[PDB]
Amino acid sequence: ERNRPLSDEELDAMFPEGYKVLNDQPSGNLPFLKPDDIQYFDKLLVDVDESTLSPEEQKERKIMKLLLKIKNGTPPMRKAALRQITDKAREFGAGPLFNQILPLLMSPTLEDQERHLLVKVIDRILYKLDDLVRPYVHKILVVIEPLLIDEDYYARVEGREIISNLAKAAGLATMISTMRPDIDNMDEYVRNTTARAFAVVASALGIPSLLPFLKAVCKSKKSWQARHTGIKIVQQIAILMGCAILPHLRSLVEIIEHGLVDEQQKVRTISALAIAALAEAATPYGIESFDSVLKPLWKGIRQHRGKGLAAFLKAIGYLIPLMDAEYANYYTREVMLILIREFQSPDEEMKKIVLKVVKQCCGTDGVEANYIKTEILPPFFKHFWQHRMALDRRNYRQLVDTTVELANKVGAAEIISRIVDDLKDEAEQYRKMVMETIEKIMGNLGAADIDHKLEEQLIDGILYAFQEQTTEDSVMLNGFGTVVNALGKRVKPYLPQICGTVLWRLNNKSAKVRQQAADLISRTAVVMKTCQEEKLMGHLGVVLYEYLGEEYPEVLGSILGALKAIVNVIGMHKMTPPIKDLLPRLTPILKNRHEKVQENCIDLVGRIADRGAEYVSAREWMRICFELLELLKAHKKAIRRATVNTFGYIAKAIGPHDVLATLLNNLKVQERQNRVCTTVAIAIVAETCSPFTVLPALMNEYRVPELNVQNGVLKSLSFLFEYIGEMGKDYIYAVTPLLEDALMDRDLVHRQTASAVVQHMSLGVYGFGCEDSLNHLLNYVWPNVFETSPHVIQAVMGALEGLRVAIGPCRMLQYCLQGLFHPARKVRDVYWKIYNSIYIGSQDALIAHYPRIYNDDKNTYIRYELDYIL
Amino acid sequence: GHRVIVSDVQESFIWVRYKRNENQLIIFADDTYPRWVTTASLLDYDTVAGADKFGNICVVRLPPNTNDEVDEDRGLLNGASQKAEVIMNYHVGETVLSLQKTTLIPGGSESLVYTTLSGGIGILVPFTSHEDHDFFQHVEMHLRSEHPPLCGRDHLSFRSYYFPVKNVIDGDLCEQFNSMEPNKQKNVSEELDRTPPEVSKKLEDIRTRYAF
Amino acid sequence: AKHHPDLIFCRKQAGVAIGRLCEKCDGKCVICDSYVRPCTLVRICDECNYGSYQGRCVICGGPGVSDAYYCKECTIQEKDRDGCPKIVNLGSSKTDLFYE
Amino acid sequence: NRFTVAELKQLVARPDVVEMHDVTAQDPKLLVHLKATRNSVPVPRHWCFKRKYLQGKRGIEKPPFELPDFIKRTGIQEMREALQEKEEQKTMKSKMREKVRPKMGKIDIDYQKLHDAFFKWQTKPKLTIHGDLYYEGKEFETRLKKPGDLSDELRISLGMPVGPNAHKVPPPWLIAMQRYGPPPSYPNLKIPGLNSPIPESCSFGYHA
Amino acid sequence: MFLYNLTLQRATGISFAIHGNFSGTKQQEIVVSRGKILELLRPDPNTGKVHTLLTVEVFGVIRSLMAFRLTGGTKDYIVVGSDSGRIVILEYQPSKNMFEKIHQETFGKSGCRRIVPGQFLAVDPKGRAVMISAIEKQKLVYILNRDAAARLTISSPLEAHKANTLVYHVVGVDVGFENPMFACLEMDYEEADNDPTGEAAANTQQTLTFYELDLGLNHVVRKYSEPLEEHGNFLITVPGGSDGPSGVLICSENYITYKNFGDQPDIRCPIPRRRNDLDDPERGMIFVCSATHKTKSMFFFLAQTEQGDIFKITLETDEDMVTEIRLKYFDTVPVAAAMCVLKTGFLFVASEFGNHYLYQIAHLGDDDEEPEFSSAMPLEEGDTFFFQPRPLKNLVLVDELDSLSPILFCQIADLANEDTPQLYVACGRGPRSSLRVLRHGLE
Amino acid sequence: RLPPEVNRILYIRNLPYKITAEEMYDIFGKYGPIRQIRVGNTPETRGTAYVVYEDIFDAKNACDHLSGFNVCNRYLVVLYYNANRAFQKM
Amino acid sequence: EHLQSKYIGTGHADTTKWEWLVNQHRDSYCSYMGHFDLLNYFAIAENESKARVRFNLMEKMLQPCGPPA
RNA sequence: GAUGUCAUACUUAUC
């Protein structure tokens, strides 16, 4: 729809004047129905006309219309439909809701966003339909089963959350009754999905809640499919819960030990995979509950060969670090020949299992470095360092981890001399994997073992890998920076060779090459100050000062980052591009609509305001404080956090008298993410300089007849109190009649802001003797507890939790008194929640503050221990 | 003098005025905070210092109006009308069973000596000037951050266990500056812009003038 | 966090594993989500930091960069003496924007 | 099961705190003991209303802000009002031309005057007790006098100049008090000229 | 007004007392906890007096204190639990003369609550774990290990919580090179609070449960749980492994029960009361301390009842099981909170009310003329063990530390006609009460 | 995967008035085929332009790599086209 | 819901006076057994020692107010 | 005062 071609008339109608060219709609304003979606919403094209023809299915028609409006309608319409379906889920019932939701999600012409919205509606309709979806457990499970095996991680996480919510709502017996015929099914994918759902239900409802059911399913001898499904469910429960199966490791190992002795090789492979998953969890301590599993497994590595032998070798490599030193030495002394014999295996899964077991076979004592370099490392370099291994990510990352383990075990130089030859290849993925392995070897071990005969070859290979890059990945730049950090002072005969290739990369037809050269200059900027190279940095800064005119904003942001790195690595007042001819040069650069370029410009402006504030005539900073108000309202959450620090630095430099009026004039914009970002900047300016100079002016902005300006001033006062803390004892009497008048307003947002300011004043002035103003503010914050808005209720709860620590738990128990036994339950629940919060805040303090209760006829409640006196 | 301070075992201590012409005893002053005080001691004509069985010790100060001319049905909150206020409260850790304002050494000043049930003996002396009190508060705020206790409990949360502290300076944390490392003592003296022998003399002069 | 009301913490037994924070959430608190006055570090549980989950962000979940710490308003209000402040489930936050 | 208010008032030692809604609770004796406690605070009156405690002052006029004397004694309010009056007359071109070349020095009164007003000229506000709650009509109920004393407004309305000479000082009900006697509801009340000396008791009444 | 609270005289009433090699030498030292102050005393055998070496203010309420020694080490670390929810493992440094906090593990909120751990603190005799249990429904077990720089390290605290279960006492059973076990007399209050008849609260006696911390599985699970016929008050662990009968005896009102599980039967012994004392119309007598001792030949326990009759109990056992428990009235001592038997013939009694004593052991054992009793004696009609009171003949008083807690009332007066005033205060509880006059001068 | 804020048309503000059609076309066609380009010829519309591309992904790439671009007049901010914001003068 | 199951003694909107009184008595007994000053005052008030007072306070935790109603 | 459609405005350093 968004990529459809448009005619000249539609293009001309969407442009204003002054520019030179160089029935099929259901019942009104319902959204557009697809031609393949005319089956679930077929009852909406005809009119309702509800008069002597309206059964209980007429509410299901409205629920289907709401689902059609939430599926393909407007996002405000989708939010209104979700608010109408969430608040009325109990009245509509789970029956027709499930009967309308289940064929809609099972359509073969669905999409990712519609399935995500259906899963969100099923998750939001599961909290009000608790203990009511037990007949609809299997119908929801048959739709949630392929969601866990999907490609996207977010859809799998949503399916796991929906399965956990269904296990928490339907209990344990209903899921065990529903998942019982789904174990012996003919479909293997449905059996694997049922095993994954059973593992998710066991993770969400506890391991001993489903342990005897899994033990009865695993020990039953009727077919190999039920035992294979039980072993797969045990392996999935071991792989899902990392450290949660450690108290229940023996009860799972005793059930897993019954397998791998049957006539079926698939059940033995599943039992070996479950043992490897259980040993994976108990990677350092699995031997304790594994002595009955080491005897049939190792003979399986001796008596047979194939996929089961590879699974047994993976289980042995997972159980070998979890044993003693002599046991691991005896295991590695008899499995190295089986690993060397499996180096020529044509199978990819056996090669991946061998590469995973080779990382764990050499990680401790017992394996010598000479034998590993003689008989283990040449076949690993000849059989695994190929071009097909770099294609798959799971075959590249495991190979890189095995190479890092071999470099940490044997040595970094012996791996570097064998991996430096692949840095100048013709493949991008193999060169990127070799650069990542070299960066990991330089970060873990270092560059001390590399002599002078290999460092120049490695630098040439890194330069050939960086100069011949076709993708936008940052692996090569990070590897070059890691090599330059590991080299240190050994790169002194390399700076005319590298930087001369950098400036030659600065003039090219492409746009990503200049950005890559600027990123490489920014990553190698810290290696120039430590090698006594100051003329080259001064030449590069003067070169990059004229490189701010690149039309690509992605290259301009990298050039700004390189200039910031050069200004950080060198002195602020000792730069050949000085601050007198750079801070006016960055003033039109700050008006860029990009995210990273404006973030780098704001960081450079904050650094120039913090370290070089004496380089301006105090007039350009006032003109940049008005451009700092347009630096907010950006969806990046980084430039808005640096603009407040830059405004605070400008207020500290030029005085807190001109930026405060600019911050108060920008408080009335009526836009989100622009008045809170100015209130935080005003609070940072009041916290950097003296806050008393910002005390009457913040008292003046509440005098203007505006709700947004008063809310921004109250938010700025609350943020200034939270930033001050213990310095708020002198500014409490000036803010007490403001907070006493803001709490009596009709607007609930001003009352919530006053409650937040009272919470900040109670949390900042605790232990200073300011319990008189806090008790006055609590008398106004106490009628605000009966609000219906969750934000105002959360602000009142935070104010109560801040005032209970300041004024004492006795005053909070006195204010919460005579409300726990209240007749009205709406006040009684809030009083019980406040009493529970006061008990969780200070439980020992409520003993002396407890009221006196008289004794009853049958029971006694008078404390005779504290009533006695000596 | 012409008044009574009836200390109750559960709520608080209540003031009662006695008349010369009549013989009635009408209570006109009470406290709102529950203390369950065991003993008490009078310091001034308006304020009264008391100690609780839980371990805390407070001082209830009368309002500056102090309307005692009440002849005699609702009060303010199920009690009297003139609710008293507190100006000092501190937790000591032990049940203080004796308190008396006197002078333990001749030539010094008056101070409240207290004897608890754990065998210890404490002394509460007021501040002469605001500069010495501010220096003691700064030394306490520096020692609470630089020298944490071995038990792991916060020093600010120890005196504010039952009742919150107000205008109470803990001298046991201020007297621990001479038993720490010399580098931390030099850093605390540089943060307070003084000398560690000068800080030790300023910490010891008040203890020598107020008590032994 | 305090912005999303549907976020739940782990609340398990806090061990010796120190929490980590990413570059996008560096300096922010775990509960109050404030960037002023850090007072006490965050201790993660054993289930939230095991294997590939070591050195990860507590709030977002990405790769950690800096050390996690609680604000000064949480240490005085006894908010750091509770369970593990690790966000486990992600509901209605950073999930619909990836699909849009 | 649920007793009436009469039995709840007769059973409790303090029947003044018993209300009509407390009889239908789950514990009338516990609620009566909690409502008649020493330091307990009552429930707000907006728990049984239907206006959510904030929809009553809609059409009522209210002042914007009451500035204290310490903030008004620095001249920041008049300078802010002058800056607002100068900015309210500027157009969009004058606002956009002042963003590229701003004029520094709008007010700049002092730096130490704010510290003197926030540290030396600090005044304690009028706080209240913790038991005195806040309501909707609490801001308008300010009526909450002594026998023998008259205010300035009552003396201006009645036309009685307050003087030390007790000949013209009392109200003209003093002749009726001389002819009929003292008031029977106040035996200890003394008025000058009848039962008190005239130049001594110049307060026109004494409660002794 | 702004005041300042200073301490003129420190607290002298000792709440907890332990002994061990804290400095790291062959001599032993005592560590006392007076609630808010921790002191270190050096029991010098040359003069017999007690000299304080360090006194620190912990600014809290120390609920439990116990010293533990690591496997293969000379110095013993102190484990302290206070009102805050953090256990502190510290080591005394003789060079700097201070208590360096080696580790501080937080596991709950502050305040003396029933949910926060810190009330009960047990340690293994080998030095492999430490158990911190609260008053009800809360428990934790930390694993102490040794890092290769000779460093003490603490692992993640395990979970051993059991809801609706209160704990009165906890101890660590001796296990040589095995799993550490923690024995506690737990009591379930669910059936006593769910039945309104009141008869369920009379058949709800405590039961001894032993949680075995499994190092291979890294978890704590309840191994055994045996009920008891009487409400136990305290537990005392016996040394085992290569020593002898590893177990935990339970003390109760006129009862001492050896209840090691597996194969040993429960051996019960009544407490020998006085001959003709008119002090118990219908009340019993329970223990207040254990004071275990081992002079590298056998093991004994210097138990102390509610009256103060210190009794030396020694258990005669077989090669693997316990045969009978024997006890005899050793001496008469004042009532103390905790007793710490030191090496080379020393005994420090820290009385909670009155002065503390430090005596020297002159006649250990005393199985020569004393009519000792045994659990295997077929005695009927109640306890049938009437011991005669006698003065101190086995121990002789060497040092008397004026540590009377109960100041109670005190007055500042100058009735002695001196220049400086004096303080007349009270001390002691019961027969040990005394009026004490104190002045600022020296003796 | 794309946000609904992106569109085939992108607006540019603070453009140089002396820029020719060839330089604007060379700046626009770097990310893909440009369907149309309209430059303002009014005193109230000077310094702004509208570039409509044929591909939505190429238009999104041009919006990502054209914002605040180097331009003589000023940063070449390139925002997305809005129907309510373009007709704000009416 | 979960707050009452995790931390005992919190309470809810349907909490009776007997359970609240039993929780307050259990908290007072825990505060007496934890603090050394209250136990010293309870031992100075009677003639029993600290161990007998602790055994009396520990045995009174099971239904301190009596049978429920 | 409540309901169900529509619009406006506000809050959570949300992205």
PDB file of all heavy atoms in Angstrom, chain E residues 124-146, unseen atoms left out:
ATOM      1  N   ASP E 124      29.499 -24.240  61.391  1.00  0.00           N
ATOM      2  CA  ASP E 124      29.982 -25.612  61.399  1.00  0.00           C
ATOM      3  C   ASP E 124      31.292 -25.702  62.178  1.00  0.00           C
ATOM      4  O   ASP E 124      32.061 -24.733  62.214  1.00  0.00           O
ATOM      5  CB  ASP E 124      30.185 -26.116  59.971  1.00  0.00           C
ATOM      6  N   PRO E 125      31.566 -26.835  62.834  1.00  0.00           N
ATOM      7  CA  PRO E 125      32.857 -26.982  63.524  1.00  0.00           C
ATOM      8  C   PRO E 125      34.042 -27.068  62.579  1.00  0.00           C
ATOM      9  O   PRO E 125      35.157 -26.699  62.968  1.00  0.00           O
ATOM     10  CB  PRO E 125      32.682 -28.281  64.324  1.00  0.00           C
ATOM     11  CG  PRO E 125      31.206 -28.445  64.467  1.00  0.00           C
ATOM     12  CD  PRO E 125      30.629 -27.915  63.190  1.00  0.00           C
ATOM     13  N   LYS E 126      33.837 -27.545  61.349  1.00  0.00           N
ATOM     14  CA  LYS E 126      34.931 -27.587  60.385  1.00  0.00           C
ATOM     15  C   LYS E 126      35.207 -26.206  59.804  1.00  0.00           C
ATOM     16  O   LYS E 126      36.362 -25.862  59.526  1.00  0.00           O
ATOM     17  CB  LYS E 126      34.612 -28.585  59.271  1.00  0.00           C
ATOM     18  N   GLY E 127      34.163 -25.401  59.617  1.00  0.00           N
ATOM     19  CA  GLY E 127      34.325 -24.061  59.093  1.00  0.00           C
ATOM     20  C   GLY E 127      34.044 -23.966  57.607  1.00  0.00           C
ATOM     21  O   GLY E 127      34.771 -23.289  56.873  1.00  0.00           O
ATOM     22  N   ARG E 128      32.988 -24.640  57.151  1.00  0.00           N
ATOM     23  CA  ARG E 128      32.638 -24.667  55.739  1.00  0.00           C
ATOM     24  C   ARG E 128      31.379 -23.877  55.404  1.00  0.00           C
ATOM     25  O   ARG E 128      31.203 -23.496  54.242  1.00  0.00           O
ATOM     26  CB  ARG E 128      32.462 -26.116  55.263  1.00  0.00           C
ATOM     27  N   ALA E 129      30.508 -23.621  56.376  1.00  0.00           N
ATOM     28  CA  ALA E 129      29.262 -22.917  56.109  1.00  0.00           C
ATOM     29  C   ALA E 129      28.835 -22.151  57.353  1.00  0.00           C
ATOM     30  O   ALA E 129      29.384 -22.330  58.443  1.00  0.00           O
ATOM     31  CB  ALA E 129      28.159 -23.883  55.662  1.00  0.00           C
ATOM     32  N   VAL E 130      27.839 -21.286  57.171  1.00  0.00           N
ATOM     33  CA  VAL E 130      27.284 -20.481  58.255  1.00  0.00           C
ATOM     34  C   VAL E 130      25.795 -20.297  57.995  1.00  0.00           C
ATOM     35  O   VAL E 130      25.395 -19.874  56.905  1.00  0.00           O
ATOM     36  CB  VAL E 130      27.989 -19.117  58.386  1.00  0.00           C
ATOM     37  N   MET E 131      24.974 -20.604  58.998  1.00  0.00           N
ATOM     38  CA  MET E 131      23.522 -20.571  58.867  1.00  0.00           C
ATOM     39  C   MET E 131      22.969 -19.413  59.685  1.00  0.00           C
ATOM     40  O   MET E 131      23.239 -19.310  60.885  1.00  0.00           O
ATOM     41  CB  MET E 131      22.903 -21.895  59.324  1.00  0.00           C
ATOM     42  N   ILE E 132      22.197 -18.548  59.033  1.00  0.00           N
ATOM     43  CA  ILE E 132      21.513 -17.437  59.683  1.00  0.00           C
ATOM     44  C   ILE E 132      20.014 -17.674  59.571  1.00  0.00           C
ATOM     45  O   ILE E 132      19.462 -17.680  58.464  1.00  0.00           O
ATOM     46  CB  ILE E 132      21.908 -16.086  59.063  1.00  0.00           C
ATOM     47  N   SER E 133      19.360 -17.876  60.712  1.00  0.00           N
ATOM     48  CA  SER E 133      17.931 -18.145  60.756  1.00  0.00           C
ATOM     49  C   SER E 133      17.229 -17.058  61.555  1.00  0.00           C
ATOM     50  O   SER E 133      17.753 -16.561  62.556  1.00  0.00           O
ATOM     51  CB  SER E 133      17.637 -19.520  61.372  1.00  0.00           C
ATOM     52  N   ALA E 134      16.035 -16.694  61.102  1.00  0.00           N
ATOM     53  CA  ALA E 134      15.217 -15.690  61.763  1.00  0.00           C
ATOM     54  C   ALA E 134      14.318 -16.341  62.809  1.00  0.00           C
ATOM     55  O   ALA E 134      14.491 -17.500  63.186  1.00  0.00           O
ATOM     56  CB  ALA E 134      14.376 -14.917  60.743  1.00  0.00           C
ATOM     57  N   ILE E 135      13.341 -15.561  63.279  1.00  0.00           N
ATOM     58  CA  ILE E 135      12.413 -16.068  64.282  1.00  0.00           C
ATOM     59  C   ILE E 135      11.366 -16.999  63.684  1.00  0.00           C
ATOM     60  O   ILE E 135      10.958 -17.960  64.347  1.00  0.00           O
ATOM     61  CB  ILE E 135      11.718 -14.909  65.015  1.00  0.00           C
ATOM     62  N   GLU E 136      10.934 -16.756  62.447  1.00  0.00           N
ATOM     63  CA  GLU E 136       9.908 -17.574  61.818  1.00  0.00           C
ATOM     64  C   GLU E 136       9.989 -17.432  60.306  1.00  0.00           C
ATOM     65  O   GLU E 136      10.135 -16.320  59.789  1.00  0.00           O
ATOM     66  CB  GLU E 136       8.505 -17.184  62.301  1.00  0.00           C
ATOM     67  N   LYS E 137       9.919 -18.578  59.616  1.00  0.00           N
ATOM     68  CA  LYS E 137       9.742 -18.695  58.170  1.00  0.00           C
ATOM     69  C   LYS E 137      10.859 -18.054  57.351  1.00  0.00           C
ATOM     70  O   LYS E 137      10.622 -17.604  56.226  1.00  0.00           O
ATOM     71  CB  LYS E 137       8.389 -18.107  57.746  1.00  0.00           C
ATOM     72  N   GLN E 138      12.074 -18.007  57.894  1.00  0.00           N
ATOM     73  CA  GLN E 138      13.195 -17.451  57.151  1.00  0.00           C
ATOM     74  C   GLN E 138      14.487 -18.116  57.606  1.00  0.00           C
ATOM     75  O   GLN E 138      14.724 -18.265  58.807  1.00  0.00           O
ATOM     76  CB  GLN E 138      13.287 -15.932  57.330  1.00  0.00           C
ATOM     77  N   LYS E 139      15.314 -18.501  56.636  1.00  0.00           N
ATOM     78  CA  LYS E 139      16.611 -19.108  56.891  1.00  0.00           C
ATOM     79  C   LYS E 139      17.500 -18.933  55.667  1.00  0.00           C
ATOM     80  O   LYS E 139      17.021 -18.828  54.536  1.00  0.00           O
ATOM     81  CB  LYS E 139      16.481 -20.599  57.236  1.00  0.00           C
ATOM     82  N   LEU E 140      18.808 -18.901  55.909  1.00  0.00           N
ATOM     83  CA  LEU E 140      19.790 -18.790  54.843  1.00  0.00           C
ATOM     84  C   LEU E 140      21.069 -19.497  55.265  1.00  0.00           C
ATOM     85  O   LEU E 140      21.388 -19.576  56.454  1.00  0.00           O
ATOM     86  CB  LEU E 140      20.087 -17.323  54.495  1.00  0.00           C
ATOM     87  N   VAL E 141      21.800 -20.012  54.279  1.00  0.00           N
ATOM     88  CA  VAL E 141      23.047 -20.731  54.511  1.00  0.00           C
ATOM     89  C   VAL E 141      24.081 -20.221  53.516  1.00  0.00           C
ATOM     90  O   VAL E 141      23.913 -20.383  52.302  1.00  0.00           O
ATOM     91  CB  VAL E 141      22.866 -22.250  54.382  1.00  0.00           C
ATOM     92  N   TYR E 142      25.144 -19.610  54.030  1.00  0.00           N
ATOM     93  CA  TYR E 142      26.248 -19.133  53.212  1.00  0.00           C
ATOM     94  C   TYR E 142      27.414 -20.111  53.295  1.00  0.00           C
ATOM     95  O   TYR E 142      27.644 -20.745  54.326  1.00  0.00           O
ATOM     96  CB  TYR E 142      26.699 -17.740  53.657  1.00  0.00           C
ATOM     97  N   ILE E 143      28.147 -20.225  52.193  1.00  0.00           N
ATOM     98  CA  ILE E 143      29.272 -21.147  52.079  1.00  0.00           C
ATOM     99  C   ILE E 143      30.553 -20.322  52.097  1.00  0.00           C
ATOM    100  O   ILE E 143      30.816 -19.545  51.170  1.00  0.00           O
ATOM    101  CB  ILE E 143      29.182 -22.006  50.811  1.00  0.00           C
ATOM    102  N   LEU E 144      31.349 -20.490  53.148  1.00  0.00           N
ATOM    103  CA  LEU E 144      32.634 -19.814  53.261  1.00  0.00           C
ATOM    104  C   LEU E 144      33.719 -20.679  52.635  1.00  0.00           C
ATOM    105  O   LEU E 144      33.802 -21.880  52.913  1.00  0.00           O
ATOM    106  CB  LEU E 144      32.966 -19.520  54.724  1.00  0.00           C
ATOM    107  N   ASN E 145      34.548 -20.069  51.793  1.00  0.00           N
ATOM    108  CA  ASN E 145      35.603 -20.770  51.080  1.00  0.00           C
ATOM    109  C   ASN E 145      36.902 -19.978  51.192  1.00  0.00           C
ATOM    110  O   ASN E 145      36.922 -18.824  51.637  1.00  0.00           O
ATOM    111  CB  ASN E 145      35.226 -20.995  49.610  1.00  0.00           C
ATOM    112  N   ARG E 146      37.995 -20.608  50.767  1.00  0.00           N
ATOM    113  CA  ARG E 146      39.325 -20.024  50.855  1.00  0.00           C
ATOM    114  C   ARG E 146      39.898 -19.856  49.458  1.00  0.00           C
ATOM    115  O   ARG E 146      40.066 -20.836  48.726  1.00  0.00           O
ATOM    116  CB  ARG E 146      40.256 -20.893  51.709  1.00  0.00           C
TER     117      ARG E 146
END
